[PDB]
Design a binder for this molecule. Structure first.
Ligand SMILES: CN(c1ccc(F)c(NC(=O)c2cccc(OC(C)(C)C#N)c2Cl)c1)c1ccc2nc(NC(=O)C3CC3)sc2n1
Ligand SMILES: CN(c1ccc(F)c(NC(=O)c2cccc(OC(C)(C)C#N)c2Cl)c1)c1ccc2nc(NC(=O)C3CC3)sc2n1
Lengths: 263, 254
């Protein structure tokens, strides 16, 4: 049961973006593919472990709303091959080209993101960076969740606007939980329903960090659209609760959106 | 890895289709899924093996033009879960509701179908039953090859006239699908006798009427179709060539 792709089969075309954590290219392998590969000559143990982990997580996922993993390649140079996505991120849609989705679609995008996050959490995978930049709107109608580090456009301020207060505070070595993912989703729901990023009235990054952290600052829920249903606004408020253990988990979140999805 | 879905996780919903070996339902498992369940709930050794073998193949595939396997269940019943396809099969579009696609889109369907088959072959997988109803036009956009079930109209003569399966026998089936796409019809529509179709195709007396292809069908395509439908097994191209051939053809067009 292997996923290694023999060398010389992958063609690498355009370079889409580069981090210190890898370089993404558009490529060809049995069709269009994205190739994330370490541009280095000799992978260090930490990088090789980073690679083994990403592959380990990606091959546990087979769900329509998660970016399809297709193979890896160690032979010439460490590389991960996924499906090539088409269109743009949810971030780009809401905050750059400013596309205007009907309410029926906004709610759909929520639903699908919720489906995917329910799936990850069922397999006990915590994303730790769910945000509209990492939600690709494939063919303009299927949510693909991934980690698109710099392959898609950057947020205003890592990425602070989606961090739950317990994460911002950084109380201990691991403040991440299914519930921190839920809060992040909560912000994505804010984005969908408002069309905007939170805290747009504040020009200082450290102040946002400080205040969200102490519970002094929270998303202004009055900026949601008239036609956004009360169920959705209520669910949004529950997800954004400042107390981790007061937040709902995705099975219920999914169930809530599914219910308001009819009618 | 392990793809066993725990018990009482999939809510089985509407029944979609039943047929001898299996029954398939629309279900809910982190969104819509399709659940295919074994009928007789005291399964026999050979049926159990069939299940093993399907899941064995299904989990070898990760490609956008292949139906997405998601998991299996053994408790209480044997069941295989895939993604749920919204839309219609290629068979249903072309022969039941008779969708009129524009040519550019028909060529794209062939591209994608060949794209998937190319993948499958690369992993030493022979489909053995490629046909229009095993091609689902997901969301009216993305082809998903699967096996959603003899299928005589798509069998190459060497198969018809009895392991005769090969990449080439898969290619012949694809040749028939191209015919379907380009004519919007099934082959041998003027013959109503199955036994005679079997005998005649096997003897080489019968082969698809390529004059029935649409007027705007490119000559390059009509030729590829003739090559994929060659009676002799070894004269048929493999999918890398087919895909390169459709590639070139589709660029002088868009
Ligand atoms: C950046 N990118 C890409 C390519 C290969 C990869 F392996 C990854 N990796 C991940 O996304 C990733 C990393 C860590 C964990 C992880 O799993 C969980 C389950 C936590 C999640 N989510 C993942 Cl999934 C990323 C890609 C991939 C496709 C792609 N398509 C693009 N299309 C375009 O840019 C054109 C329209 C403009 S960019 C792109 N980047
Ligand atoms: C019938 N079906 C479905 C469900 C579960 C399954 F496991 C399979 N299996 C296969 O298709 C299959 C079987 C044997 C081998 C095999 O692999 C090869 C390599 C030959 C291939 N390809 C496979 Cl892949 C099939 C499904 C699945 C989705 C689905 N969606 C539907 N939607 C609708 O009918 C309504 C919108 C109109 S029906 C359906 N059936």
């Amino acid at each position: 049961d292997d996923w290694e792709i023999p060398d010389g089969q992958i063609t690498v075309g355009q370079r889409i973006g580069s981090g210190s954590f890898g370089t993404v290219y558009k490529g060809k392998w049995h069709g269009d593919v994205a190739v994330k590969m370490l541009n280095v000559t000799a992978p260090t143990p930490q990088q090789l472990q980073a690679f083994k982990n990403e592959v380990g997580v990606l091959r546990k996922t087979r769900h329509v709303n998660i970016l399809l993993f297709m193979g890896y390649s160690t032979k010439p140079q460490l590389a991960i091959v996924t499906q090539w996505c088409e269109g743009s991120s949810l971030y780009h849609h809401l905050h750059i080209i400013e596309t205007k989705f009907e309410m029926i679609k906004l709610i759909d995008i929520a639903r699908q993101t919720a489906q995917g996050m329910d799936y990850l959490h069922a397999k006990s995978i915590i994303h730790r960076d769910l945000k509209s930049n990492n939600i690709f709107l494939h063919e303009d109608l299927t949510v693909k969740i991934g980690d698109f580090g710099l392959a898609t456009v950057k947020s205003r301020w890592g990425s602070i606007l989606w961090m739950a207060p317990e994460v911002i505070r950084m109380q201990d070595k691991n403040p991440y939980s299914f519930q921190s993912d839920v809060y992040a989703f909560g912000i994505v729901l804010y984005e969908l329903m408002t069309g905007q990023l939170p805290y747009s009235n504040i020009n200082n990054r450290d102040q946002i960090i400080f205040m969200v952290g102490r519970g002094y600052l929270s998303p202004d829920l009055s900026k949601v659209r008239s036609n956004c249903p009360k169920a959705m606004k209520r669910l949004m408020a529950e997800c954004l609760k400042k107390k981790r253990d007061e937040r709902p988990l995705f099975p219920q979140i999914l169930a809530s959106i599914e219910l308001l999805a009819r009618s």
